[PDB]
Short mmCIF file of all heavy atoms in Angstrom, two decimals:
data_model
loop_
_atom_site.label_atom_id
_atom_site.label_comp_id
_atom_site.label_asym_id
_atom_site.label_seq_id
_atom_site.Cartn_x
_atom_site.Cartn_y
_atom_site.Cartn_z
N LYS W 38 -41.99 -48.74 29.16
CA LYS W 38 -41.39 -49.50 30.25
C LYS W 38 -41.52 -48.77 31.58
O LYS W 38 -41.79 -49.39 32.62
CB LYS W 38 -39.91 -49.77 29.95
CG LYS W 38 -39.18 -50.60 30.99
CD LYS W 38 -37.67 -50.35 30.92
CE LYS W 38 -36.87 -51.54 31.43
NZ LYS W 38 -35.83 -51.14 32.42
N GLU W 42 -43.44 -50.05 34.91
CA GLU W 42 -42.79 -50.20 36.21
C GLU W 42 -43.59 -49.50 37.30
O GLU W 42 -43.75 -50.03 38.40
CB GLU W 42 -41.36 -49.65 36.16
CG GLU W 42 -40.39 -50.47 35.35
CD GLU W 42 -38.99 -49.87 35.33
OE1 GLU W 42 -38.87 -48.63 35.34
OE2 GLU W 42 -38.02 -50.64 35.30
N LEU W 61 -43.64 -59.07 35.10
CA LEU W 61 -43.69 -59.34 33.67
C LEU W 61 -42.34 -59.82 33.16
O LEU W 61 -41.30 -59.33 33.58
CB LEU W 61 -44.08 -58.09 32.88
CG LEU W 61 -45.47 -57.54 33.14
CD1 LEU W 61 -45.72 -56.30 32.29
CD2 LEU W 61 -46.51 -58.61 32.88
N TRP W 62 -42.38 -60.75 32.21
CA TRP W 62 -41.19 -61.41 31.67
C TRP W 62 -41.32 -61.36 30.16
O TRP W 62 -41.84 -62.30 29.54
CB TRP W 62 -41.08 -62.84 32.21
CG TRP W 62 -41.22 -62.86 33.69
CD1 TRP W 62 -42.39 -62.90 34.40
CD2 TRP W 62 -40.17 -62.84 34.66
NE1 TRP W 62 -42.13 -62.90 35.75
CE2 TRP W 62 -40.77 -62.86 35.93
CE3 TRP W 62 -38.77 -62.79 34.57
CZ2 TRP W 62 -40.03 -62.84 37.11
CZ3 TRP W 62 -38.04 -62.78 35.74
CH2 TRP W 62 -38.67 -62.82 36.99
N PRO W 63 -40.90 -60.26 29.54
CA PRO W 63 -41.05 -60.15 28.09
C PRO W 63 -40.17 -61.17 27.37
O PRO W 63 -39.10 -61.54 27.85
CB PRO W 63 -40.59 -58.72 27.79
CG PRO W 63 -40.75 -57.98 29.11
CD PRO W 63 -40.40 -59.02 30.15
N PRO W 72 -25.30 -56.63 25.80
CA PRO W 72 -25.85 -57.61 26.75
C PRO W 72 -26.96 -57.04 27.62
O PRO W 72 -27.88 -57.77 27.99
CB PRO W 72 -24.62 -58.02 27.57
CG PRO W 72 -23.44 -57.72 26.68
CD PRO W 72 -23.83 -56.49 25.91
N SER W 73 -26.91 -55.74 27.93
CA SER W 73 -27.88 -55.15 28.85
C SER W 73 -29.28 -55.04 28.25
O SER W 73 -30.22 -54.73 29.00
CB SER W 73 -27.40 -53.76 29.28
OG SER W 73 -27.38 -52.87 28.18
N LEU W 74 -29.45 -55.27 26.95
CA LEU W 74 -30.73 -55.09 26.29
C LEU W 74 -31.50 -56.39 26.08
O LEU W 74 -32.67 -56.33 25.68
CB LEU W 74 -30.53 -54.40 24.94
CG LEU W 74 -30.23 -52.90 24.97
CD1 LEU W 74 -29.66 -52.44 23.64
CD2 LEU W 74 -31.49 -52.12 25.31
N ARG W 75 -30.90 -57.54 26.36
CA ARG W 75 -31.48 -58.81 25.94
C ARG W 75 -32.67 -59.20 26.81
O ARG W 75 -33.73 -59.59 26.28
CB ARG W 75 -30.41 -59.90 25.98
CG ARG W 75 -29.28 -59.65 25.00
CD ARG W 75 -28.10 -60.58 25.26
NE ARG W 75 -26.92 -60.15 24.52
CZ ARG W 75 -25.69 -60.56 24.78
NH1 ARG W 75 -25.44 -61.40 25.78
NH2 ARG W 75 -24.69 -60.12 24.03
N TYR W 76 -32.53 -59.11 28.12
CA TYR W 76 -33.61 -59.45 29.04
C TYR W 76 -34.18 -58.19 29.66
O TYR W 76 -33.45 -57.23 29.94
CB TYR W 76 -33.11 -60.38 30.14
CG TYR W 76 -32.46 -61.61 29.60
CD1 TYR W 76 -31.08 -61.73 29.55
CD2 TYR W 76 -33.22 -62.67 29.12
CE1 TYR W 76 -30.48 -62.85 29.06
CE2 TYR W 76 -32.63 -63.80 28.62
CZ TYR W 76 -31.26 -63.89 28.59
OH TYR W 76 -30.65 -65.01 28.10
N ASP W 77 -35.49 -58.21 29.92
CA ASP W 77 -36.19 -56.97 30.26
C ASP W 77 -37.31 -57.25 31.25
O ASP W 77 -38.37 -56.61 31.20
CB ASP W 77 -36.74 -56.30 29.00
CG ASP W 77 -36.82 -54.81 29.14
OD1 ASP W 77 -36.19 -54.28 30.08
OD2 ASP W 77 -37.50 -54.16 28.32
N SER W 78 -37.08 -58.16 32.18
CA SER W 78 -38.08 -58.49 33.18
C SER W 78 -38.36 -57.31 34.09
O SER W 78 -37.49 -56.47 34.36
CB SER W 78 -37.63 -59.69 34.01
OG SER W 78 -36.51 -59.35 34.81
N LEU W 79 -39.60 -57.26 34.58
CA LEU W 79 -40.08 -56.24 35.51
C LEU W 79 -40.63 -57.03 36.69
O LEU W 79 -41.76 -57.52 36.63
CB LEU W 79 -41.15 -55.36 34.88
CG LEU W 79 -40.70 -54.57 33.64
CD1 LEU W 79 -41.91 -53.72 33.20
CD2 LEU W 79 -39.50 -53.71 33.90
N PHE W 80 -39.80 -57.22 37.71
CA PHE W 80 -40.09 -58.13 38.80
C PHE W 80 -40.05 -57.37 40.11
O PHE W 80 -39.09 -56.63 40.36
CB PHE W 80 -39.10 -59.29 38.85
CG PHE W 80 -39.31 -60.19 40.02
CD1 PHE W 80 -40.36 -61.10 40.03
CD2 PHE W 80 -38.47 -60.12 41.11
CE1 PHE W 80 -40.55 -61.93 41.13
CE2 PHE W 80 -38.66 -60.95 42.19
CZ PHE W 80 -39.69 -61.85 42.20
N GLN W 88 -38.11 -53.27 43.26
CA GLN W 88 -37.91 -53.86 41.95
C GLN W 88 -36.53 -54.52 41.91
O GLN W 88 -35.54 -53.91 42.31
CB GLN W 88 -38.01 -52.81 40.85
CG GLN W 88 -38.01 -53.41 39.46
CD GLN W 88 -38.16 -52.36 38.39
OE1 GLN W 88 -38.44 -51.20 38.68
NE2 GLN W 88 -37.97 -52.76 37.14
N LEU W 89 -36.48 -55.76 41.43
CA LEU W 89 -35.21 -56.46 41.26
C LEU W 89 -34.86 -56.60 39.79
O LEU W 89 -35.70 -57.01 38.98
CB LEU W 89 -35.23 -57.85 41.89
CG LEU W 89 -35.42 -58.01 43.40
CD1 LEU W 89 -34.66 -59.27 43.85
CD2 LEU W 89 -34.97 -56.80 44.17
N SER W 90 -33.63 -56.30 39.44
CA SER W 90 -33.15 -56.43 38.08
C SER W 90 -32.36 -57.71 37.84
O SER W 90 -31.87 -57.92 36.73
CB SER W 90 -32.28 -55.23 37.74
OG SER W 90 -31.19 -55.18 38.65
N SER W 91 -32.26 -58.57 38.86
CA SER W 91 -31.25 -59.62 38.87
C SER W 91 -31.41 -60.60 37.72
O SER W 91 -30.43 -61.20 37.27
CB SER W 91 -31.31 -60.39 40.20
OG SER W 91 -31.38 -59.51 41.30
N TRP W 92 -32.64 -60.80 37.25
CA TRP W 92 -32.82 -61.75 36.17
C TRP W 92 -32.32 -61.22 34.84
O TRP W 92 -32.26 -61.99 33.88
CB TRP W 92 -34.29 -62.12 36.04
CG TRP W 92 -34.77 -63.03 37.12
CD1 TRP W 92 -35.38 -62.65 38.28
CD2 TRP W 92 -34.71 -64.46 37.15
NE1 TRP W 92 -35.69 -63.75 39.04
CE2 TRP W 92 -35.28 -64.88 38.36
CE3 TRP W 92 -34.20 -65.42 36.27
CZ2 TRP W 92 -35.39 -66.22 38.72
CZ3 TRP W 92 -34.31 -66.75 36.62
CH2 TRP W 92 -34.90 -67.14 37.84
N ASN W 93 -31.95 -59.94 34.75
CA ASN W 93 -31.67 -59.34 33.45
C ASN W 93 -30.20 -59.29 33.07
O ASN W 93 -29.90 -58.82 31.96
CB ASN W 93 -32.25 -57.92 33.40
CG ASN W 93 -33.75 -57.91 33.45
OD1 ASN W 93 -34.39 -58.90 33.09
ND2 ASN W 93 -34.33 -56.81 33.91
N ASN W 94 -29.27 -59.74 33.91
CA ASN W 94 -27.87 -59.78 33.46
C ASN W 94 -27.67 -61.02 32.61
O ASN W 94 -27.92 -62.14 33.10
CB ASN W 94 -26.86 -59.78 34.60
CG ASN W 94 -25.41 -59.58 34.10
OD1 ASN W 94 -24.88 -60.40 33.37
ND2 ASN W 94 -24.78 -58.47 34.51
N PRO W 95 -27.25 -60.90 31.36
CA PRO W 95 -27.12 -62.10 30.52
C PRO W 95 -26.15 -63.11 31.08
O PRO W 95 -26.27 -64.31 30.79
CB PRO W 95 -26.64 -61.56 29.17
CG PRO W 95 -27.03 -60.13 29.18
CD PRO W 95 -26.93 -59.67 30.61
N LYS W 96 -25.16 -62.67 31.87
CA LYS W 96 -24.19 -63.63 32.39
C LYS W 96 -24.88 -64.69 33.23
O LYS W 96 -24.39 -65.82 33.33
CB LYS W 96 -23.12 -62.92 33.21
CG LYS W 96 -21.97 -63.82 33.64
CD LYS W 96 -21.15 -64.27 32.44
CE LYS W 96 -19.90 -64.99 32.88
NZ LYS W 96 -20.24 -66.35 33.40
N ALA W 97 -26.01 -64.35 33.85
CA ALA W 97 -26.65 -65.20 34.84
C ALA W 97 -27.63 -66.20 34.23
O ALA W 97 -28.22 -66.98 34.98
CB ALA W 97 -27.39 -64.35 35.87
N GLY W 98 -27.81 -66.21 32.92
CA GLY W 98 -28.62 -67.21 32.26
C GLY W 98 -29.93 -66.71 31.70
O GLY W 98 -30.47 -67.34 30.79
N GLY W 99 -30.48 -65.62 32.23
CA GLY W 99 -31.78 -65.15 31.79
C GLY W 99 -32.90 -65.96 32.42
O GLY W 99 -32.69 -66.81 33.29
N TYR W 100 -34.12 -65.68 31.95
CA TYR W 100 -35.32 -66.24 32.56
C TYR W 100 -36.17 -67.09 31.63
O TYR W 100 -37.14 -67.71 32.10
CB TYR W 100 -36.21 -65.12 33.12
CG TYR W 100 -36.54 -63.99 32.16
CD1 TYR W 100 -37.51 -64.13 31.18
CD2 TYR W 100 -35.89 -62.77 32.26
CE1 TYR W 100 -37.81 -63.08 30.31
CE2 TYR W 100 -36.18 -61.73 31.42
CZ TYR W 100 -37.13 -61.89 30.44
OH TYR W 100 -37.38 -60.80 29.63
N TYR W 127 -33.28 -65.15 44.10
CA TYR W 127 -32.88 -63.79 44.43
C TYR W 127 -33.61 -63.24 45.65
O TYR W 127 -32.98 -62.57 46.47
CB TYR W 127 -33.10 -62.91 43.20
CG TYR W 127 -32.21 -63.34 42.03
CD1 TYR W 127 -32.76 -63.85 40.86
CD2 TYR W 127 -30.82 -63.25 42.11
CE1 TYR W 127 -31.95 -64.25 39.79
CE2 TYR W 127 -30.01 -63.63 41.06
CZ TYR W 127 -30.57 -64.14 39.91
OH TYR W 127 -29.75 -64.52 38.88
#
Side-chain angles (χ1 to χ4, degrees):
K38 182 203 206 229
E42 290 179 325
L61 296 180
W62 310 85
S73 66
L74 285 163
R75 296 168 192 163
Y76 305 101
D77 210 15
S78 67
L79 299 182
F80 176 76
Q88 188 178 350
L89 297 211
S90 59
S91 313
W92 286 94
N93 294 335
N94 190 297
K96 187 67 172 73
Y100 52 78
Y127 297 115

